[PDB]
């Protein structure tokens, strides 16, 4: 006796069974003419059941047709078709509120899907997922709601990490969506602090994309690790709306990661960081057109090993990672090209340190262009700003191209009075030479931005300014950078040096530049003073000469080892 | 001719075939009532071969029905179901044994399954695997064995390198247990050393669950790399229990790696890494709970990229990462943070270097906590203890925080000689000020530990101890920390000062202490001694002092610079 | 009303619809007795389409047969068998083309596939892809053709960001091949620079292995990003045809990555990259037996965290890493065990910098052996050589190991004075005590390689040489070499010393080593000069001492901390 056959659930609702006598039946397909989810039943005739659709399912009768399943659970087996105005979401709650019970995996089929309601789906990493093999596109222009997908587990110790990542949460699901205030994406967590205690590690969302939302990726209440594994998100409504997370956050931040990340296309979007003691790292990760930006109150640790920053197409002039306000937080980046296209000039710090914060860059090559200008805003001519600390290590800071190389971070300085804040005349070493009555002396509250200011008036003779500092880590690199400003000029008022010497005093080399005639604010340090130390160099000898006449001014007179 | 059906294997063997003229048969389900694994036999009526279950299965007349195969490989296809008291290794036994013959891909069903009995399973993996979507759970509670699952290549070198990586090994399986002694988990490898060197390279274990084993995972002779993608062993019956290497190893440990592993949860079990030439790599890997010790004859090479220490609850003083003995080997840590709880006192050091081994740690944050009391058992108060050597590049360590904070390592103090080990009175400028005989001589053999102790018994008069020392890096941070003694306490004789200072001798700022009135062996620089150095320093003065009448003495007097 | 049944595909062609009443027909296999890819067929009796094998086919009579799809799209459903003469790439071709309408993924079938012809296949990432789970082989000796896989999208912009990493683009295939010019593996890219600029990012490439082809893998035009997860290539026809990159490429190289990848077995074969602003990160891989080599217009900047180098059975002399010609790239290890096995003599530098390239290495360990006889060929016994830089920090270079330990590089060195590069006698103190007229002057143009010789003939009494140089970095290692050569040998003329001293000039140890009596140009600082410095050391002192009688003369006396 071989099985019946149905074209659609329809028509096996329809048939009465009083009169049937078989075994099981065979369906192609639920929606007539979709030939998708062909399914066996098999006749109940007596008993009751909850009497759900894709499992048990319920005829006109009365008697219920209990499923029989073989190998994976398929999601659009329930009612779920590839459409394009046809609501699916039900049927895929439906379906994972079934593959709960008996815990399993949930695949979707492929095509583009259509969602549409007012409430979201509450994945259970330890239950099952809405992993997809064969690429599935949802649709959520027409959806509404708070958050379309919600990541938490109920159990609170017991069953969670003994089964949570045996199988990944979320593969493959393409969202669209629309540009639209109070609608955004995928939270991890819980969004409420009261309840128990979630435990979910080791939850893996791999190959998924999320674009167009208000908030494409939002961090909840006891959502500590979790392993994004080459993950994108693109296009956010308001700034700060790719990755959030809330200051709000408890017992949650403990070392996530990201796998070959990527957040891209940023049109007037952020990251930002705002938490105690979070731990997050990057691998082999590039976010490019994306201002990572970090205010946290207490210590946040963010290491970023081979990644990548830049900005293939923009006239905007914004800055790559900074750290707003915190107590003391770390920014780590190993191994990773930095690249800079061009531009119609900067005005801006590419990267920002604030009050006790540090960024620690090794392994690390630094660009240099001819349209920065960064002294046009922070003062000195630098790759940083800030009263933050920066170290760096092994950094390759690349020598020539064009225009040359700028130093990176003025905490890095070797000589002691640099932005003159000593208030007086120490530290420097002044020489004038035969008459007397030539004037360097220091005058304070007259700068570019307030810092004091060692103009030398020489007359009928040149004056000398000299300073010897320590050379650390063997070979290393100059990189140049001094403001100047010059009131009057008559003449080439320059030769500006910089001498190597060894233990002994004996010469090995120098590099000199010329003073413009230019009046404005110039910077000096840009070519003609960079350059490798030879090997076995122990002092650097900076020396400052004006001819007698024209009238100069210095400030920010620093050097930047390696 | 539609083909004829079967509702259970029984009765698919009793039928006889001597009157039926039929091309195909199809099944079900092996077992009645399960509804799993149905298949489609043809049948050959009049061959001979081996008979196996699942395929070319025999029926009681004597033809031998051959299965046809469509797409994968199913394993729960012989004889395996889910269920609580139903065995299961033989059909996986089978099933992986079929599999390997026109080797392919070998699947298992979802649900929790049960196996039983006194052999393991040998996975080949340049042959098949046990890679499991749906979350395949497996118990052995019942089962007795040396091994569940043994990993080794029959192959030497011809074809194992050229497939081995094209899938993985296992994966999806969730293996229970009971704490009983000579039963354990998964090994790498062989379990003895003769016979062919195999060549199992490239294998990979993904998301895969052990626990309560007495070795939950053992490497063996010719395991050099492996790929563990996420995996957390947890409940080891003894010590060392959770991942464990014999030192009676050869050939093997060529750059193993671990990608987002875990070990938790371990009562009263260790990790121990006992080999020569063996590299490990962890990269964004937290294991807590732990105790990471090492003791390797030879070099052992262990690093680390963003893994996190910690304890979420426990009032034990275990002791992070330890090395026991050895000759020379390293650990590495970088861009992992490292967190400590609350504790009832901690009377230990959290990590521990011997005899000339080594560990680094680069872009690293150090916290402090009030409940550390270090110098209880190793003399100084400090991170570390013992007598190998630690370097650090890079490392934040936090500034501020309530109590404040504590210097790494001795070995990198500035200061010479820090210990009184010079047995005299050198590096150490004394300075009786108007009366002579005030008595500020060292005496040996008597101290915390048994180190020399500096006191000093000044009369109607101070006495002034002081050194100089250079800094490095620029600026960095202070973390004292002084062991003092005070058998005698009239006043406050404290006033214990250090400077900083330029290359040319000009005061930039210090910190000052004062010593208590407690007669017991406290410690000073938990506060009011930390900082970070102001940009431009060259070298840092020590400052002793002591007022007339109460006599004092210190140790350790170490400065500990970044 | 059951469907008919048809056992081949032939038989279902030959049979005509004219009286046949049926909405459906079931194919058992596409091929008589294969039994695989069984398909579901309706009739549409009157409409007109394409008329492909696997979907839509076409009968004699006309009416066309239209597949229904459930699940995964299987690729050996249209014409693909495993087999080992029978052609299958025109099925496979076909499926693709198929796939790529509605997109979805193509899944390969297990066993051993053949392919021939004269056309490779054009994956496009965006659309579909060649994943097969069952560990796919193909056999491509018969086959003949530019390149078999061609990997580019034709999107722009628009839709290929959006989705592209949904899903692996190739994943396990197996393919064989013979070694003739002209053919090779897999491009990245468009293998010409006309035309539509490709974006494909993001594309995985995972549980690949490529073998015997001119070109295992190369690089083509518009090919930034890429992931290559577990691939390994070996045994390539001529050198450099395992990884290759055009010089004449394109807006190519944003940070490509590599997990636990792989190439060995290399007879005869390289790895070149040659491109301007190149990025490549390599995470916990190890390659054999390949000499890396980088020669670069511009910067090219490669990373290796956890990354092996080793040779596990060879007597060639090839150097693992080298850069032979570039303005400035940067070469980074991490955490990566170098080992060197046993060989009959190396006479090589194993790494080597050239012109201002720079290697920096970091939580390295530094092996050492007695048959490197490095000083044979680049002048100093060194672990390195070339005019480039080397910088390294927190590495191990263990100490003891039989016959002791080499330095790395030269550019290292703490005296200014090693090379005789001054062409006098600066940077070295020379005591001739009592007696005047002893020789130790200075002439050029003679040595092993060009650079001058310090002899010293001293008559009736000793000369000493000494030398102060500065620590840095605390405690470190010596690992001394110096190139010695005694023209004349009465008696043991040796007593090289090296002493630590601290800040206030007090000794605290020393390591002394005696000259020979042998002729030839001997080395010095193997054994009997290394040691770890004192906790507290500040300076290092040489002193060279010869006994009057035997003339000698010194070169390349360089130290070489940490």
Same mark, same amino acid.
């Given at each position: 006796g071989?099985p019946?056959?149905?074209?659609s659930?329809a028509?096996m609702?329809?048939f +009465?069974?009083?009169?049937?006598?078989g075994?099981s039946?065979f369906?192609?397909?639920?929606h007539?003419g979709?030939?998708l989810?062909?399914?066996?039943f098999?006749?109940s005739k007596?008993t009751?059941?909850?009497?759900?659709?894709?499992?048990?399912?319920?005829?006109?009768d009365?008697?219920?047709? #209990?499923?029989?399943? &073989?190998?994976?659970i398929?999601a659009?087996m329930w009612?779920?078709?590839?459409?394009?105005?046809?609501?699916?979401?039900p049927?895929?709650?439906?379906?994972?509120?079934?593959?709960?019970?008996?815990?399993?995996?949930?695949?979707?089929g492929?095509?583009?899907?259509?969602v549409?309601?007012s409430?979201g789906?509450?994945?259970?990493?330890?239950?099952?997922?809405?992993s997809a093999l064969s690429?599935?596109?949802?649709?959520?222009?027409?959806?509404?709601? &708070?958050?379309?997908?919600?990541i938490?587990?109920?159990?609170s110790?017991?069953?969670?990490?003994?089964?949570?990542?045996?199988?990944?949460?979320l593969?493959?699901?393409?969202?669209?969506?629309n540009?639209?205030?109070?609608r955004?994406?995928?939270?991890?967590g819980?969004?409420?602090?009261?309840?128990?205690?979630?435990?979910?590690?080791?939850?893996?969302?791999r190959?998924?994309?999320?674009?167009?939302?208000?908030?494409?990726?939002?961090?909840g209440?006891?959502?500590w690790?979790?392993?994004?594994?080459?993950?994108?998100s =693109?296009?956010?409504l308001?700034?700060?709306g790719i990755?959030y997370?809330?200051?709000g956050?408890?017992?949650?931040?403990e070392?996530?990661?990201?796998?070959?990340?990527?957040?891209?296309?940023?049109?007037?979007?952020?990251?930002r960081i705002?938490?105690?003691?979070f731990?997050?790292?990057?691998?082999?990760?590039?976010?490019?057109?994306?201002?990572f930006?970090?205010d946290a109150g207490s210590?946040?640790?963010?290491?970023?090993l081979?990644?990548?920053f830049?900005?293939?197409?923009?006239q905007?002039t914004?800055?790559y990672?900074?750290?707003?306000?915190?107590?003391?937080?770390?920014?780590?980046?190993?191994?990773?090209? #930095?690249?800079?296209?061009?531009?119609?000039g900067?005005?801006?710090?590419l990267?920002?340190v !604030?009050?006790?914060?540090?960024? +620690?860059?090794?392994?690390?090559?630094?660009?240099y262009?001819?349209?920065?200008?960064?002294?046009? &805003?922070?003062?000195?001519?630098?790759?940083?700003?800030?009263?933050?600390?920066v170290?760096?290590?092994?950094?390759?800071?690349?020598?020539?191209?064009?225009?040359?190389?700028?130093?990176?971070?003025?905490?890095?300085?070797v000589?002691?009075n640099?932005?003159?804040?000593?208030?007086? =005349?120490?530290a420097?070493t002044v020489?004038?030479?035969?008459?007397?009555?030539?004037?360097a002396?220091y005058?304070?509250?007259?700068?570019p931005?307030?810092?004091?200011v060692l103009?030398?008036?020489?007359?009928?003779?040149?004056?000398?300014?000299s300073?010897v500092?320590?050379?650390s880590?063997?070979?290393? !690199?100059?990189?140049?950078?001094?403001?100047?400003n010059?009131?009057?000029?008559?003449?080439?008022?320059?030769?500006?040096?910089?001498?190597?010497l &060894?233990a002994?005093?004996?010469?090995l080399?120098?590099?000199?530049?010329?003073?413009?005639?230019?009046?404005?604010?110039?910077?000096?340090?840009?070519?003609?003073?960079?350059?490798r130390?030879?090997?076995?160099t122990?002092?650097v000898r900076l +020396?400052?000469?004006?001819?007698?006449g024209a009238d100069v001014?210095?400030?920010?007179?620093?050097?930047?080892?390696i």
């Open positions: 071989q019946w056959r149905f074209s659930v028509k609702k329809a +009465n069974y009083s009169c049937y006598l075994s039946v369906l192609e397909s639920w007539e979709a030939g989810g062909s399914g066996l098999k006749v007596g009751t059941e909850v009497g759900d659709d894709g499992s048990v399912i319920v005829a006109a009365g008697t219920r047709l #209990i499923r029989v399943f &073989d190998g994976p398929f659009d009612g779920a078709l590839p459409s394009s105005t046809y609501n699916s979401l049927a895929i709650k439906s379906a994972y509120l079934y593959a709960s019970s008996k815990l399993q995996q949930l695949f979707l492929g095509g583009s899907y259509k549409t309601g409430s789906i509450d994945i259970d990493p330890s239950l099952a997922g809405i690429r599935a596109r949802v649709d959520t222009t027409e959806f509404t709601g &708070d958050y379309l997908f919600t938490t587990s109920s159990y110790y017991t069953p969670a990490p003994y089964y949570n990542n045996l199988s990944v949460a593969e493959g699901l393409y969202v669209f969506g540009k639209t205030e109070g955004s994406g995928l939270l991890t819980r969004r409420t602090t009261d309840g128990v205690k979630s435990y979910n590690g080791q939850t893996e969302i190959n998924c994309t999320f674009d167009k939302f208000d908030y494409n990726i939002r961090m209440h006891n959502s690790r979790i392993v994004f594994y080459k993950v994108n =693109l296009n956010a308001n700034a700060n990755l997370v809330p200051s956050l408890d017992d949650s931040g070392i996530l990661t990201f796998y070959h990340c990527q957040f891209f296309d940023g049109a007037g979007s952020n990251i705002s938490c105690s003691s731990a997050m790292t990057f691998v082999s990760c590039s976010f490019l057109n994306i201002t930006t970090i210590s946040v640790s963010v290491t970023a081979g990644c990548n830049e900005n293939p197409g923009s905007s914004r800055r990672i900074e750290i707003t306000a915190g107590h003391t937080n770390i920014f780590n980046v190993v191994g990773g090209s #930095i690249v800079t296209n061009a531009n119609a900067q005005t801006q710090a990267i920002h !604030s009050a006790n914060n540090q960024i +620690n860059l090794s392994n690390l090559t630094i660009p262009g001819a349209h920065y200008q960064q002294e046009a &805003d922070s003062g000195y001519h630098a790759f940083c700003s800030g009263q933050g600390y170290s760096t290590s092994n950094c390759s800071l690349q020598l020539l191209n064009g225009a040359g190389c700028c130093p990176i971070h003025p905490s890095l300085s000589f002691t640099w932005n003159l804040s000593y208030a007086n =005349l120490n420097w020489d004038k030479g035969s008459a007397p009555t030539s004037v002396e005058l304070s509250a007259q700068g931005k307030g810092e004091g103009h030398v008036a020489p007359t009928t003779q040149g004056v000398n300014i300073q500092a320590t050379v880590k063997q070979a290393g !690199s100059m990189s140049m950078s001094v403001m100047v010059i009131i009057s000029a008559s003449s080439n008022a320059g030769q500006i040096s910089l001498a190597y &060894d002994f005093d004996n010469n080399g120098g590099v000199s530049a010329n003073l413009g005639t230019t009046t404005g604010w110039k910077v000096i340090g840009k070519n003609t003073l960079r350059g130390l030879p090997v076995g122990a002092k +020396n400052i000469q004006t001819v007698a001014q210095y400030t920010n007179i620093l050097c930047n080892i």
